[PDB]
Amino acid sequence: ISPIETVPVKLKPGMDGPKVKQWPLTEEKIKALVEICTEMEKEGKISKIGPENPYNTPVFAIKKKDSTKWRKLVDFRELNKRTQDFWEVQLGIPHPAGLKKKKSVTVLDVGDAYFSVPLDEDFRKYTAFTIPSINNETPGIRYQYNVLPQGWKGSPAIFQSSMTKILEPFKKQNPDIVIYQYMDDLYVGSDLEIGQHRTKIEELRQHLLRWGLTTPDKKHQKEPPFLWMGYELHPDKWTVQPIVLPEKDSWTVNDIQKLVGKLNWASQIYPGIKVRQLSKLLRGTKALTEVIPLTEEAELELAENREILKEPVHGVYYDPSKDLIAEIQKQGQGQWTYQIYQEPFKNLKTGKYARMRGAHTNDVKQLTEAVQKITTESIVIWGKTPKFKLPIQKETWETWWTEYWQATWIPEWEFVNTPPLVKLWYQLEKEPIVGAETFYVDGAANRETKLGKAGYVTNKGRQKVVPLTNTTNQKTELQAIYLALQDSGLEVNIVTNSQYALGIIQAQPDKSESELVNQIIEQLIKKEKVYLAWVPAHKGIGGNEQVDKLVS
Amino acid sequence: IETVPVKLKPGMDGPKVKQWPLTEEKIKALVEICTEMEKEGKISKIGPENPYNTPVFAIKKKDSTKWRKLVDFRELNKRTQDFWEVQLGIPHPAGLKKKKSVTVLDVGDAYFSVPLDEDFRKYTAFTIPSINNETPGIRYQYNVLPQGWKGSPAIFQSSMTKILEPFKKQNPDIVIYQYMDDLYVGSDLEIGQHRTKIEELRQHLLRWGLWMGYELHPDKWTVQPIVLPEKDSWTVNDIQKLVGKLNWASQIYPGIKVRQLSKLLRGTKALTEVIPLTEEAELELAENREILKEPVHGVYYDPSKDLIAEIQKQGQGQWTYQIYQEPFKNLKTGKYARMRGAHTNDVKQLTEAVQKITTESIVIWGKTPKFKLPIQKETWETWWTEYWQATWIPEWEFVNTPPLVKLWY
DNA sequence: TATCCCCCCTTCGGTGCTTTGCACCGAAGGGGGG
Ligand SMILES: O=C(Nc1nccs1)[C@@H]1C[C@H]1c1ccccc1
């Protein structure tokens, strides 16, 4: 064994170690001495300190985890917040699509490496644990950890630091050997011949044994496929582990959440996954034991997802000698899919974007949100922003970014004709229309009464006022614009006294959470030319003062 | 010199900021630069026990090929206990605005000779991420004064004064003011002699302790008052929009009166009808136009407040901005126009406008402003690094409400 | 009644201000994989 250095660990200042007794347990689930404890004491992972360590921690045996293997899962829920904080240095999880074409691949596993990495001397006392012996009728003996506990707050960071320190000399001495080290896995690949690669693997094993870490051949995976973090590595292919979707005839909300989660997990390779109808059932919902009915849309969506998943699909590994191309498609209701690839019909990765940013948004903005996401994911996974192949027309994009009040950009894209193509349905007018009808719209509502009036006046003299109930001033403004749009012809000039409504319709939305806005968009797309203008309120400007008195 | 102990303000802990993802070339440049720095001993690798982290970005300054490291210090500067007030950052030359030429020099490399206080070393930690998360982030720690920290010039003040004393001795025709890592050198003399003299100043600094160059002209800077349209025949829509603009201006200038202008709009006419102005209307319009032409009265800088900068997109590559401490007491209203080669990149235009505005604000008042960017946070954080060149970073907030304003166009 | 990571999704009081509703957002929990 080698003397791998320990890391100094302390509690948070001004607060001391916990003392938590153990909940009542069962004789079947426990022992007079938890038989693994004595063996670990002999092995050196645990020592005995009885009189002068008046600290404790909850200890139990797990039956659900690892197929009732009875793992010694000691719970440190209190000491975790009682101890100092740590900065975990790894953020995400490696993706095979970021891997290269390596001729020889071997996966090494380090079993119980946490219990092999030593713990700091001072902090050993704070991890004291005791267990009752028989039916909680005997006290038992109090022990204390000598190595890294399983599930302690600093354990992952400390183990990663120790393991990268161990692996540093070997990586330095061999630059051609690639070694992915995530948590408790060790993917090792190379461009060497198979025999020489296995020889290097044996040198790696002997090096780790010199450092006290062993890689048992029980978990040492020799030949492909190599199960890696739930993926199936092949010489020229990768695939997620085969998925077993719930085929239950009845569907609870818990089962629906399981379905959508497994569908999201399968979405990174299977194209065309949609979960919007299965999440509209999740919003609001009900008690988890309530048998949730399935809408026709939801069941059609599930059938389509099943027919997608009934065939196998696979990705390909990265090749730095080529370029990355991503094509975006539109799936309606605010759903988008992309197929990042390098050569046609062999896609490195796949995914979906279905978020709704804002109560009022349209196709162009959501496509910009999709490209801006794909960008940051591609940066994370490859370090290069891909070339986009968008459905938006170049003229439409130019118009949008030149006339929009924000700063928007898309890195580099070529227009691809794949319907439904993103296009702007309606445009407003910059100059008043010659020979159009002018409407002065105003709506006044008292919040203390939850009533109000909405209507308009016109230069040609026609007037209208409708009473309102259970609506706010904003609503009244939107309804006033709605009446002005409805009662007018294909060309109309509307004067409004509401910056809120003027900004909402000016943002040029296509879909909204408000039926008022949806109806307004339908009227506007039906119309041919529409102009909007804003005047101050209570300014005595023309018939606006009169209509204000009418709707007050 | 000796290390001056640095402590935080009472009751609040050090920085904890995540690291934004970087591209392949930026990561490679960062790795090479940090390897060289560690070999020189300027940084030391650190373990997991440090719970502090600040983001680091890689940039490439203009007219160069070498990459340059840039570490975001915003949080640490905001947390540090008064190395801008208790230390020599207070005095700002009121005559810096009135100079024909203002040059910007780079003096950040001089800070790498003074070690930092050991009790404060733990706070200046940063992480270098890896592609695809392939390896844990290579953490580090500064062994010397860090570039971009507000207390770094505070520490180096005692040496910078000594270095610059002879230059002010033989040549007291230049006003000198440094903000963080940069030195603003301004001379009121002819531009031809100005460039040759900086070479001597650069030579003097070179031998005692780089070949780039910047140029500003603070004299040719004016506040932009708002102006009403000047038309002979006025339409109903044009009169309504003019009255709206005057109502906007009324919150700023109390002298504006729109009683007669509102009296002119008395019934319902079509938007395209022409309304001829009356005598009283013309008189009121002339008075209001003179009031608007007159520079704003009552605006005074207050050091107890903070500067807030608005930015509006006016279209066709033109932007406007306003620096103020109170929303109706604007200190400087300006305008930016798209430069050649950047007419098709809103992120690039806004990023260069931010640098121009902050440089002007530093030169004028000696306090960088709090930006209010008209952009999405996600796309800004994604693409603002590819175009940034300054070695300092302001604090910006985002806005998603439309401005709707033609008041500044 | 195990820890910590990425991810998806909906629900929430909390501030801007665009007012006292409304738009917007970050902090949690409910799942998926480690
Ligand atoms: O060890 C591991 N092996 C595996 N490879 C493939 C599938 S599971 C998992 C990464 C480990 C982990 C699990 C729970 C909590 C913390 C950490």
Numbering used by the authors:
A (entry chain A): 2 to 553
B (entry chain B): 5 to 213, 228 to 427
Question: Which passages does the manuscript contain on this structure?
Answer:
HIV-1 reverse transcriptase (RT) copies the viral ~10-kilobase ssRNA genome to a dsDNA in a multistep process. For the DNA synthesis, RT binds an eighteen-base-pair stretch of a duplex substrate with the primer 3′-end nucleotide occupying the priming site (P site). A dNTP complementing the first template overhang binds the N site and the nucleotide part is catalytically incorporated by RT at the 3′-end of the primer with the release of pyrophosphate. Following each nucleotide incorporation, the DNA is translocated from N to P site to accommodate the next dNTP.
